[model samples]
Target: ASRLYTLVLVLQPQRVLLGMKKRGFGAGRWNGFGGKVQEGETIEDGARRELQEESGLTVDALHKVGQIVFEFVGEPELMDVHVFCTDSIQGTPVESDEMRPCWFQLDQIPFKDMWPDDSYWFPLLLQKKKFHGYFKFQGQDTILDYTLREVDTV
Candidate 1:
């Protein structure tokens, strides 16, 4: 009972490249670039396409770092997000209408303005550990229940 989506993190040159979502859903939050998967498109390909749409960045290879199930109270839909990261990439990141490009130093990541679950797993991500997680949100800012752990494979 979930819809598939993708989230791509551009870990470039010791900094984290993120986009400030500007509209709809998680608008005003800083997070990785991604969107809903398109029909008939493979997951990784869907991720790549969304990354291009939001960041104007391209990559030949992306590392699958995590998988997460996010559920919200009172919502009939759930989002299964495939998380990816890439340090090796092509093209300059330019801001699109949906997101504003920004780079955060490892120590300066703005967790407060991101989806609550991000604050929990982001550190694991920075440590280069693969992970799996599930989160139930009572509201966007408050987590009702969750489970998160390192994984052998994404």
Candidate 2:
């Protein structure tokens, strides 16, 4: 069985993107850039392809900051998500036919606009700290979880 990985992108925000649309499960919803890995393609190549496919901008820089691997019981499928961080990129941002790419001031990210799992660790990434997390969900509802980081400062 093969695995799928993604390089989620953070893009600059625009008024149109703010009101853009999403497709698939959550059609008309906005999200970061990402997709799948093709045969014979390097991880970096897949990342670039996904990001560009989702958002029409080539990453100026990509830093692997974290990862999440999802394993299902009695199934031969896996989703290995490679997390990357970048405050820079070249070219203009264009909404993928599927997702409307947009920027939310790190603090203004619409957790509701993203996968439920995002709310748990995205903030840690914004702080430049590394994290590891597991999310098990049925449909759109998260069922189980684990995170390798302390959230509260206390």
Candidate 3:
């Protein structure tokens, strides 16, 4: 089985917005704001809602920058995630039951505490490029194999 998800990032001139996952799939990690896509909702709609729900900020615009398929060993379900980014937003970020909000300078991102695959694609997004990627993980922090490339369209 496969499930859809979204990851929305707010990028300022020199910093990026991220959240510390309080619980669930990627808990204990610092990551972009996002979650599962509900039935009958578009990926973008879900992305917007999740962002606001988790961070208290509403994006003025969301640019689809990438898509990543995650296949974990022994996990039956695949995570098909759409990645979105925006520089325009409203409201201050606040902590939620699911996340603790924070911002980091581009050069100061805590990649070691995030999912391993993040390091591979996050840079492309910051560069304003579209991309597609697949990651097969042996465990939370180990990538068994993967492929990533800049794309003309996401």
Candidate 4:
């Protein structure tokens, strides 16, 4: 079964915020702030909560930008990630128990250190186009294959 998750990206003029996971699932990779959705919480609320918890920033206006389903070779569960982005933020990005937050210029995002799927959809995100995609992984780092397309709405 597919489990719901959230991923939020904070965008500033010419820049974007990313977090380095300190432990657990994505440890060592630079990526957006988010995690599994809490039970009974709305998807958007879960996204906002994870963002605030990991980056110490609160976003008031978040726009849905993408949706991706990730499947691992032998893993039984799917990661159904709903992605959002916002430029309107409150508070500063700070390190938390789960993440170390940092910013990168739009031209400097380190895709080599992020989920492989990011390289496919991030350009679409930067263009402000909604998108939907699916990624199948062979292991922790290699993307066996994937499909991505820009959409009118996510």
Relative to the true structure, how large is the alpha-carbon lDDT of every model? 0.92, 0.62, 0.92, 0.92
Residue 25, model 4, lDDT = 91
Per-residue lDDT of 69-126 in model 2, one digit per residue for the tens? 6655445776777766666777777855565666566557777866667677766666
Every candidate's CA RMSD: 0.9, 4.7, 0.9, 0.8
Clash count, candidate 3: 0
RMSD of 4: 0.8
TM-scores of the candidates are: 0.97, 0.78, 0.97, 0.97
Per-residue lDDT tens digits for candidate 1, residues 1-154, read 8999999999865799999988998998999999899999999999999888899988879899999999999999999999999998788889878789899999899999999899899999999999999999997889999999999988
Kindly give the stretch of ten consecutive residues in candidate 3 with the minimal lDDT sum.
120-129
In model 4, pairs of residues that clash are none
Q: Could you tell me the lDDT of residue 151 within candidate 3?
A: 93
Give the lDDT of residue 57 in candidate 2: 73
Relative to the true structure, candidate 2 has a C-alpha RMSD (angstroms) of 4.7
* Whole-structure CA lDDT of model 3: 0.92
Q: Compared with the true structure, what per-residue lDDT tens digits does model 4 show for residues 1-154?
A: 9999999999887999999998989899999988899889999999999999899998999899999999999999999999999999999988878788998999999999998889999888898889999999998889888898888878
Better of 2 and 3 by lDDT: 3
Worst 10 residues of 2 by lDDT: 11-20
Clashing pairs in 2: 21-28, 22-27, 22-28, 22-29, 23-27
